[PDB]
Amino acid sequence: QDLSEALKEATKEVHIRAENSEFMRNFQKGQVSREGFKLVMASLYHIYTALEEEIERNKQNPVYAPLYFPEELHRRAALEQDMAFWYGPHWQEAIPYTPATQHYVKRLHEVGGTHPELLVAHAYTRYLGDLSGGQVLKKIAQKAMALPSSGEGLAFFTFPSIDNPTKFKQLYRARMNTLEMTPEVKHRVTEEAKTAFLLNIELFEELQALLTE
Numbered sequence: 650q651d652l653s654e655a656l657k658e659a660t661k662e663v664h665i666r667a668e669n670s671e672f673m674r675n676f677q678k679g680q681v682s683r684e685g686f687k688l689v690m691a692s693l694y695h696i697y698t699a700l701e702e703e704i705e706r707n708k709q710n711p712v713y714a715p716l717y718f719p720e721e722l723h724r725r726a727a728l729e730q731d732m733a734f735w736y737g738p739h740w741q742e743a744i745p746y747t748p749a750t751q752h753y754v755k756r757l758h759e760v761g762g763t764h765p766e767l768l769v770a771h772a773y774t775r776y777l778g779d780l781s782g783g784q785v786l787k788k789i790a791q792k793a794m795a796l797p798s799s800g801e802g803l804a805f806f807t808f809p810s811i812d813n814p815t816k817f818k819q820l821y822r823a824r825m826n827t828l829e830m831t832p833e834v835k836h837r838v839t840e841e842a843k844t845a846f847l848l849n850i851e852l853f854e855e856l857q858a859l860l861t862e
């Protein structure tokens with residue numbers, strides 16, 4: 650069974666759970682506040698920062714390299730733009746770094762530094778979601794918060810170097826499927842993708858609590 654399939658199958662249950670966190674339920678109904686949107690976007694800033702640091706560290710390592718698509722996919726620069734938009738020119742000292750965000754970053758570093766053959770799980774879990782359901786989430790955010798079609802404040806959701814997310818996502822899958830795979834690696838990769846999903850659920854749980862306090 651192809652890795653791209655193994656991953657989709659292994660994470661379909663947890664994805665349903667992630668969509669139904671209180672925060673994402675509220676987000677999907679169009680109930681997202683500037684305050685809640687800023688918190689999640691600032692948390693993604695840190696998460697993608699760490700993910701992309703580890704991607705760069707491992708760019709030439711054959712357990713990751715077929716997935717090295719910085720120009721098309723990387724989000725740090727977009728998130729920086731969004732932080733300037735939502736937090737102002739001194740955003741770097743204004744943005745929060747929550748404990749659940751710290752926890753996700755810590756695991757990212759563990760993987761990139763000690764278990765790089767698992768880094769595909771983490772890239773799959775964030776980027777493939779961004780290219781599919783993230784585009785739906787984009788449209789809800791825009792409508793909720795009166796964000797302009799010109800894209801300010803939603804740079805994260807915009808892929809100016811990908812013409813067509815569906816076709817790119819098929820390419821990314823195809824390339825995933827060229828990674829050297831043994832039963833060992835495959836089984837652990839799909840386990841780590843479940844953990845990546847859980848780290849996201851735990852973030853959403855935390856942000857909801859911070860918003861309700």
Ligand code: HEM
Binds near residue numbers: 676677782783849
């Ligand atoms: C309300 C929240 C969410 C909505 C409405 C949503 C919606 C979607 C939709 C419509 C797809 C396409 C499904 C398909 O093509 O069969 C998708 C795929 C994906 N989503 Fe999300 N999603 C949400 C949250 C998340 C979260 C929190 C994560 C991970 C952090 C995530 C990760 C992914 C991944 C990795 C895929 C690709 C599945 C694959 O094709 O292998 N999603 N989601």
